[PDB]
């Protein structure tokens, strides 16, 4: 939901590691250049 999203906030957004754009936490992929975040998959945690 990029167009009007009261639920999610803009401060939580992320910067594309390729094109450097502001994409919402969901989905974790640039809606412009189509690039997934660098750290999305939950690794082994203790
Ligand atoms: Zn991008």
Curated annotation (Swiss-Prot):
Recorded superkingdom: Eukaryota
Binding site for Zn(2+): 16, 19, 30, 33
Tissue: Ubiquitous. Isoform Mdm2-A, isoform Mdm2-B, isoform Mdm2-C, isoform Mdm2-D, isoform Mdm2-E, isoform Mdm2-F and isoform Mdm2-G are observed in a range of cancers but absent in normal tissues.
Stretches that traverse the bilayer: none
Modification comment: Phosphorylated at multiple sites near the RING domain by ATM upon DNA damage; this promotes its ubiquitination and degradation, preventing p53/TP53 degradation.
ZnF bounds (RanBP2-type): 10-39
Induction conditions: By DNA damage.
Localization of this protein: Nucleus, Nucleoplasm; Cytoplasm; Nucleus, Nucleolus; Nucleus
Associated pathology: Seems to be amplified in certain tumors (including soft tissue sarcomas, osteosarcomas and gliomas). A higher frequency of splice variants lacking p53 binding domain sequences was found in late-stage and high-grade ovarian and bladder carcinomas. Four of the splice variants show loss of p53 binding. Lessel-Kubisch syndrome: An autosomal recessive progeroid syndrome characterized by short stature, pinched facial features, prematurely gray hair, scleroderma-like skin changes, small kidneys and consecutive kidney failure, followed by severe arterial hypertension.
Other remarks in the entry: MDM2 RING finger mutations that failed to ubiquitinate p53 in vitro did not target p53 for degradation when expressed in cells.
Function: E3 ubiquitin-protein ligase that mediates ubiquitination of p53/TP53, leading to its degradation by the proteasome. Inhibits p53/TP53- and p73/TP73-mediated cell cycle arrest and apoptosis by binding its transcriptional activation domain. Also acts as a ubiquitin ligase E3 toward itself and ARRB1. Permits the nuclear export of p53/TP53. Promotes proteasome-dependent ubiquitin-independent degradation of retinoblastoma RB1 protein. Inhibits DAXX-mediated apoptosis by inducing its ubiquitination and degradation. Component of the TRIM28/KAP1-MDM2-p53/TP53 complex involved in stabilizing p53/TP53.
Description of its domains: Region I is sufficient for binding p53 and inhibiting its G1 arrest and apoptosis functions. It also binds p73 and E2F1. Region II contains most of a central acidic region required for interaction with ribosomal protein L5 and a putative C4-type zinc finger. The RING finger domain which coordinates two molecules of zinc interacts specifically with RNA whether or not zinc is present and mediates the heterooligomerization with MDM4. It is also essential for its ubiquitin ligase E3 activity toward p53 and itself.
Oligomer and partners: Interacts with p53/TP53, TP73/p73, RBL5 and RP11. Binds specifically to RNA. Can interact with RB1, E1A-associated protein EP300 and the E2F1 transcription factor. Forms a ternary complex with p53/TP53 and WWOX. Interacts with CDKN2AIP, RFWD3, USP7, PYHIN1, and RBBP6. Interacts with ARRB1 and ARRB2. Interacts with PSMA3. Found in a trimeric complex with MDM2, MDM4 and USP2. Interacts with USP2 (via N-terminus and C-terminus). Interacts with MDM4. Part of a complex with MDM2, DAXX, RASSF1 and USP7. Part of a complex with DAXX, MDM2 and USP7. Interacts directly with DAXX and USP7. (Microbial infection) Interacts with herpes virus 8 protein v-IRF4.
Family: Belongs to the MDM2/MDM4 family.
Protein known as: E3 ubiquitin-protein ligase Mdm2
Organism: Homo sapiens (Human)
Organism placement in taxonomy: Eukaryota, Metazoa, Chordata, Craniata, Vertebrata
């Amino acid at each position: 939901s990029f167009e009007e999203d009261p639920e999610i906030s803009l401060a939580d957004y992320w910067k594309c590691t390729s094109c450097n754009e502001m994409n919402p936490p969901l989905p974790s992929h640039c809606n412009r250049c189509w690039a997934l975040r660098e750290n999305w998959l939950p690794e082994d945690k203790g």
